[PDB]
Amino acid sequence: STPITGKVTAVIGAIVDVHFEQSELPAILNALEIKTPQGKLVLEVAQHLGENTVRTIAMDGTEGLVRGEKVLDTGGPISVPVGRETLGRIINVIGEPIDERGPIKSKLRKPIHADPPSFAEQSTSAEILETGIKVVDLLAPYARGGKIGLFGGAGVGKTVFIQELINNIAKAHGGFSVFTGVGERTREGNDLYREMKETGVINLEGESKVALVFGQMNEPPGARARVALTGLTIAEYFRDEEGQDVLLFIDNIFRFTQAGSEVSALLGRIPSAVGYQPTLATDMGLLQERITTTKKGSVTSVQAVYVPADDLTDPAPATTFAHLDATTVLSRGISELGIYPAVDPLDSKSRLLDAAVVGQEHYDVASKVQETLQTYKSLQDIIAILGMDELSEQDKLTVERARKIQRFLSQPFAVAEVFTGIPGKLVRLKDTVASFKAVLEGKYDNIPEHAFYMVGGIEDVVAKAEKLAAEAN
Amino acid sequence: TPITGKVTAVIGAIVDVHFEQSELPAILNALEIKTPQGKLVLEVAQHLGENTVRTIAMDGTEGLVRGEKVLDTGGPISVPVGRETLGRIINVIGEPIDERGPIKSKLRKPIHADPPSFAEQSTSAEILETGIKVVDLLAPYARGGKIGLFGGAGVGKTVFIQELINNIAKAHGGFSVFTGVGERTREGNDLYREMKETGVINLEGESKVALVFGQMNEPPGARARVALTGLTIAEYFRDEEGQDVLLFIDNIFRFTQAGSEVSALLGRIPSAVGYQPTLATDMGLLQERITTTKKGSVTSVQAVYVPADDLTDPAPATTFAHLDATTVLSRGISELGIYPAVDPLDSKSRLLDAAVVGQEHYDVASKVQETLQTYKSLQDIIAILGMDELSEQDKLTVERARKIQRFLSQPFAVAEVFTGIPGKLVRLKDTVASFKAVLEGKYDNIPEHAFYMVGGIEDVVAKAEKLAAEAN
Amino acid sequence: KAQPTEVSSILEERIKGVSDEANLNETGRVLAVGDGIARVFGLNNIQAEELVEFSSGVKGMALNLEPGQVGIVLFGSDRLVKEGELVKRTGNIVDVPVGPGLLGRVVDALGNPIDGKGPIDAAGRSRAQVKAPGILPRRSVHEPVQTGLKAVDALVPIGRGQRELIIGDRQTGKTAVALDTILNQKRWNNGSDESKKLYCVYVAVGQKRSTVAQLVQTLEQHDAMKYSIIVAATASEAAPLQYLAPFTAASIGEWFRDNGKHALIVYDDLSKQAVAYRQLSLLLRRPPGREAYPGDVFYLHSRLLERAAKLSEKEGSGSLTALPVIETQGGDVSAYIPTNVISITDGQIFLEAELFYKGIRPAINVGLSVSRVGSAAQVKALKQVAGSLKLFLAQYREVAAFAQFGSDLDASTKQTLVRGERLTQLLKQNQYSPLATEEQVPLIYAGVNGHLDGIELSRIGEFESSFLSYLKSNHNELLTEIREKGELSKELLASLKSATESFVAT
Amino acid sequence: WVRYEASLRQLEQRQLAKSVISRVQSELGNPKFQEKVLQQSISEIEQLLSK
Amino acid sequence: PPPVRLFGVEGTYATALYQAAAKNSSIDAAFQSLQKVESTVKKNPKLGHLLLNPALSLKDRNSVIDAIVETHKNLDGYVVNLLKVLSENNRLGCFEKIASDFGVLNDAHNGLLKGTVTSAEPLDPKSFKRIEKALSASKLVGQGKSLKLENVVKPEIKGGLIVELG
């Protein structure tokens, strides 16, 4: 046909301005191509600046861009290959395979920009997702068709937590899973890809029931922004056209907001609170609403929010809290004392913690665990200042029991054996609720609190207590 | 020939008007725009340039188009002034909000007037007995002076000011004015109903109070200028009528809030805490016109809303220097059950002098203040370590200060909706005698509960006797 | 299916008629469309905040009318709109369909049906931006709003026309207490007395679509969707839609208020509306105020909330009750938006995670939760009757002031501590369990007599259920007496005391 | 059965929307670019006759 | 009282020139001199629009503005003043020129290329804009009809879209 040629007029960091002629203006978020010596550069039209000039966001590095270079309009937004062909392949933001295994022979390439399915939702938030992690299986149950937050700052252990999530779930899940790796470590992605390869999760010459998306934080802001969108395109195509339950996996959903703020700083927008993009809520909602159960298929989301400067009140983590059925807040303070995973027991929360879905027994156990932990945190100040002696017998017993539960919350992970030094444990929901019910009644008050450290079920607690009392003492 | 202009820009609450004649309207002039919903008034705030003036809309900018005919009134906003305004609700543009017909006032003065000169600054130290123990003890109010009600959201400012209207407004004798600046419309309604019941507003006869409202539902310009409208009414009462005036402005901080509100869109660089650069200037221009001159006295009571309960916010912090008697309502004391919520420490007034309230009054107030200060210095030591570790004298001081803090709470007649106890009118002399008796240790045996929500020391004794009787 | 046929024919005939008589010449042409907003030259006769129709079909609204160009906020995505596209001004200020047919339906910000249940039957069109009633047309709030939860009814009662803010931290029960208030109205809405019927309007601004589906199904189960109204402003939806949806829902509630009916609109979130309006201002080139929030977030909140009022008998005696929310950050009540909204609402309801994990299931923070009309807007059987029910709040404040941290002085202090602990034990209420005033009053009375000798604090949970069952059996005469009469007589108080003693004996 | 019939109505509306693409393609290949121009021109003439 | 508003923003110069002309005379003479200026500018492209760069000292801007002064002082009226003030101000001088012709066009010709659904260009030279637009449209549809690229009727797609969505 007739190519739509545009001329580069401004290159502002990761943002490129393109000027067209009369009646050839690409719409917002259209994909634009420039034949750079290293390959092709994709530009997404962020704004129309008028006078037939469009403000665009770069999918790759803007070095080597000369003003006036020819710009080709693809005729639509960025299209990523979709279908079972992409399963087992590693794809960047653009859509080309980066797994060096040849081009993807996908029959369709759905655009990364799609409208939410509106009110095609279901209130099926009643199926507990058994992950094997005793703390989340007790305090903040995960939804099979819902969204999991998995908050945390630097360190804390969010990456090992999500990796344990894949290891326990995607191995024996009835459907496909998609990992996006939004602005994370490329070495982490390589290691986790190798880990799935060893487990047979991604079999190159086989079923390979998992599709991988990458474009980690080494990529420019536009990439880190749109890699979540392309992973969502993969997930939505598997969810609707294939009718399969999909295990989404986003290693850092915050990096999308970080990239949005980065491009907004160059988009000529007055900054929002804490210097974020003003549209942070709008783009964040547009991102999260593509992750919905929908009439056909279902999605599990599983996010991982990075809180800047360990500030839970930061605008992006505050905004993402609404778009999450269950959250798992990892606090660095708990990480200091060594209870791992560092999930905050009384900051994770889950909509699934209701007696109708839970069963009024596990719900009561979780409520009493929260009771003990909240009392412990309330009394920490006078415990440090005065000590345990000042408290009455009931308060002293409550503090000791809460310490025991908080130690018991630690659970070894199979993906963290090199760190713990102890083989990982997968605790069933019934096992952990029975164990914590037994703990709450005081049946294990005589057992030292250290026996609850890096253990699984209550039988493991008894075994560790016996070993410490006999072999160690 | 009337001066005509055309609307050039409508940016939120401000409207830009261009006049095709060199005779541009002066700043603060009133601009009239004919609208289907009624009449829209615009107050000129800036001369942008090229025969364009930046104005602030008095009403909502609903349905404004670029090119609307704008009529210049030739002067600032004029509101009715005189006895006709008594018992009538006044809008920001002088219109009667209540549909009682037009106001037949023969005088219409502009809301923008020069503050009284330093020569006409007649000042007095007359005591004002409001019947509230804390006020008559620690922060005495001055007749003809300026009274401040500092407090956060939901601390007691509106209830406290309603208590002043009930107490002193009925027995004032002169003409008082209430100016609702950016407040709750339902609050204004209950205020109107309460004055109708108390008789200070007599619809079918003579009323002693003029009603001016700029409730928050109004646009920012109305909230900014309604204080000036009520101020002009009070000034006309003070100067021309030569009568004592009680200008009740509820939460005057809305004026500065609206000024900072319009400043951002007025092309003004925001000041600290995102306020208007001129906050001190326009706020003082408003406050100084509230003063007692040689022609009359204005016993104004102004509530001040502190954002985020932060007393260091620029607006209330600068408003403090414009105020004679200060009453600070902190959330902390209210959280302890003291419903008046007046923090006894920073609640200070210039009248607290031995030459004004008397040597005994000053001594009693000072002793109360040192007792509360010794209490406050012992917050953490008691909370984290324990009252047992204190000395016997320190324990006695702590318990006496607890009794005093309970005794500060007083039943307000308008507060029966919350307390459930009938309001009490504790006299100044009664308050002084009760507090000097308590400070002497005469009632150390009486439990702290008997001082909670009571009037005089006789009420304390009666409540203690009732408590002993029911305890058996 | 003749219905799609004739509706298509009618719509296309209307389009033909519009084309035959349009003569649109001063219509605008888009210069620069940004992120969900477009600047358009032309429209020399455009009204401010007037709806416009872009050539692509996306509706718009005019906040800033600069000389020459006007800023149009888009009520949808900016996918379809491009530079040079025609914009068609609708000629009328943005409005929302209103009427009784909106009941049982879920609508977006503009009022279009999004539940897929067919077209909306509206008795009329009301402006999204409507001036609040004046000083005189309102009336003092006296008719209570029966929330159905013990703590909020006893300590912070809500009345018809009152504005009570449900301020709290994240997932601390804000929408939960909103839901119990929502559901408790089924007792009266299933009757015939319209003066006691209280139609409901939920504002889901900033919430996710899955949460709104949870909401609508929950209302469906407990026979509540028929009298409730869902105005959903999805986060994925354009920020102007989030900004406008609470205003349109306020107009919808004002329809009931002005027609002699009582409406409860819960402005749930509204901090998401605040940040959406912050986005609107920060891309509309408006310089911000504090923490990058625009100047009129206070004016916005106040103007929106003040539309909720109790009209006088001359105006039909209608009422419009507001239940706004504030999502505080880390319990920061002393923040700009929180204290701003608290200064608007007629009292606030504070919820923190501290009491939520401490056991208080309503998470009612009796300290910072205060209602501006205590005696009024409360059930007569619950307000004071025996006196202690009136200073209930003062007693709670005392219990907080001399809690377990304070030294246990004497037997009187021990009794006061026991009374307070038993009382806060009683106030816990399970979710989706609206407990009526005819059942609230006996429990509050039992919290003053027979409370101290409770067998362990944990057993009061089952003690409450057993006491309800006891009041149901051969004591329903007392329940219906306190439900119908409203006030409690001396003989009624004696009978209640006798029943309490008989139960505590067992 | 009620919400099954509601879903059936939704599905028939969706299938009509699916057939809308064939409806559009019917006039896409139809040499419609001459009669439509004349009709819109005479409609414009009639529109301006009143004005 | 200029016929049409340029709303400033680089358009104030054209309005100022029009006001200066309308003060006494030369609504046209200054305008054909300005058109000659633009024609001379486009006659030498590398020498007529590259010279309008911001990186140019005031002395060389003055030398340029004398350079356009040529051919028996075709520069007449207040145009010379416009170049003089543009030398000491924003240099490049095309859009304010177009604004000048557009202003004079509204002053004396009053044409606009409307048609709503019609993607035509029916320019009309008449101040009474009531019925002559119909004659212009009839002439345009009669003779010419070069492109007629309607780009799909919007009423049909809009109506279909609302029909399927309900």
Ligand SMILES: Nc1ncnc2c1ncn2[C@@H]1O[C@H](COP(=O)(O)OP(=O)(O)O)[C@@H](O)[C@H]1O
């Ligand atoms: N199951 C586990 N056992 C022991 N340590 C863990 C576990 N999970 C996470 N960690 C800890 O997490 C920390 C950093 O983890 P990671 O989440 O990768 O950092 P970041 O959140 O900055 O990406 C390490 O110090 C490591 O000890």
Ligand SMILES: Nc1ncnc2c1ncn2[C@@H]1O[C@H](COP(=O)(O)OP(=O)(O)O)[C@@H](O)[C@H]1O
């Ligand atoms: N003297 C008092 N007696 C009883 N309750 C009071 C008293 N003062 C304040 N309160 C409580 O504090 C609140 C005061 O609110 P109000 O002063 O009207 O708001 P604002 O502080 O914003 O003006 C009321 O809800 C009331 O319960």
Ligand SMILES: Nc1ncnc2c1ncn2[C@@H]1O[C@H](COP(=O)(O)OP(=O)(O)O)[C@@H](O)[C@H]1O
């Ligand atoms: N009776 C109750 N009151 C309040 N919250 C409850 C109750 N019972 C259970 N909950 C839990 O508390 C949470 C309330 O949070 P919610 O009201 O949804 O806040 P948000 O909507 O801001 O997340 C729910 O997820 C629910 O699981």
Ligand SMILES: [Mg+2]
């Ligand atoms: Mg990481």
Ligand SMILES: [Mg+2]
């Ligand atoms: Mg909620």
